């Protein structure tokens, strides 16, 4: 029996005036599979915000998002706990539709994190909007991805810069698994292959 639960995104309805996923609102994402709206994850979430009586977000509770398979809007991640090497909280995210876009441009934005891999092992479609992945000083694998297989509209482009050097990534063992096709990988394991050779 397959069940699907739709929930409001950040900025919409129950989260009308929220800036980010935070300690107070994150419980309301439990069992959600489809986000009708956007998800913002900002630095505010982690240091807390007394002005809104919002305490700091416990990083373990991000794992609530593991049930999200779809996002109609965009995914913006601008802060993430250091001790997490990837975005496994979104390891089951399949689709980002991008009906709404950040700055009217981006459907997926991963900025200034310390991750070493994206880990979006389940991502199969970014229907609209651009992808920006910059400033992640330790992030490898991002350049291997064949984004054209994931896009859906015409002028979708990427902006992937100022991450970990490909040479430094290849120098270390951080390269797609030998079972991965030339379509890239989200990480070093076969589960992280976009497609298997």
């Amino acid at each position, epitope marked *: 029996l397959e069940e699907k639960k739709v929930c409001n995104g950040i900025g919409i309805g129950e989260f009308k*005036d929220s*800036l*980010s996923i935070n300690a107070t609102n994150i419980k309301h994402f439990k069992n959600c599979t489809s986000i009708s709206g956007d998800l913002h994850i900002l*630095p505010v979430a982690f240091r807390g*915000d007394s*002005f809104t009586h919002t305490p700091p977000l416990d990083p373990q509770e991000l794992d609530i998002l593991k049930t999200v398979k779809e996002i109609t809007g965009f995914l913006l991640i601008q802060a993430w706990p250091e001790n997490r090497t990837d975005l496994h909280a979104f390891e089951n995210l399949e689709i980002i539709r991008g009906r709404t876009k950040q700055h009217g441009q981006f459907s997926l934005a991963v900025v*200034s994190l310390n991750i070493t891999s994206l880990g979006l092992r389940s991502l199969k479609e970014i229907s609209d909007g651009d992808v920006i992945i910059s400033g992640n000083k330790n992030l490898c694998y991002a350049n291997t991805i064949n984004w054209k297989k994931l896009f859906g509209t015409s002028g979708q482009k990427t902006k992937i810069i*100022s991450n970990r050097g490909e040479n430094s990534c290849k120098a270390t063992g951080q390269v797609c698994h030998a079972l991965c096709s030339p379509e890239g990988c989200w990480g070093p394991e076969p589960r992280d292959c976009v497609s298997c050779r």
Partner: nanobody, 124 residues
Framework: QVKLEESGGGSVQTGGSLRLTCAASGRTSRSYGMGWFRQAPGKEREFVSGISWRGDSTGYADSVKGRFTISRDNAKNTVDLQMNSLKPEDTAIYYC?????????????????WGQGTQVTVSS
């Protein structure tokens, strides 16, 4: 829920002064500590100056201590950065930033909203 726009940049001669402004729009009627950053080609984005919501607390990087002055006008919803005695070593794209809360921060990792940036070129 805050959009930021930098202005006041362009070309300047060494020894000259220049005043950058950051205009905020959107949900502006809550606490934001505001910061100024800059990114020179090749180099990574560094902190320049920061100011608290109230405007009573301010910070400056050592490279600009004495020469730069930050201020804000919460009524106009603006943040100015007065740059004097400019040097070629100040050439960079200057970014304005906001961090939800009262305090400013000296790292880029605490700021929730960023501007597009303005180029500031300093020549002999």
């Amino acid at each position: 829920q805050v959009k930021l726009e930098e202005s006041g940049g362009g070309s300047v001669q060494t020894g000259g002064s220049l005043r950058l402004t950051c205009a905020a729009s959107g949900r502006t009627s809550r606490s934001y500590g505001m910061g100024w950053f800059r990114q020179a080609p090749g180099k990574e984005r560094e902190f320049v100056s920061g100011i608290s919501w109230r405007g009573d607390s301010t910070g400056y990087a050592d490279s600009v201590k004495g020469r730069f002055t930050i201020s804000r006008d919460n009524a106009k919803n603006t943040v100015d950065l007065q740059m004097n005695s400019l040097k070629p070593e100040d050439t960079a794209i200057y970014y304005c930033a906001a961090a939800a809360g009262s305090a400013w921060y000296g790292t880029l990792y605490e700021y929730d909203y960023w501007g597009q940036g303005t180029q500031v070129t300093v020549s002999s």
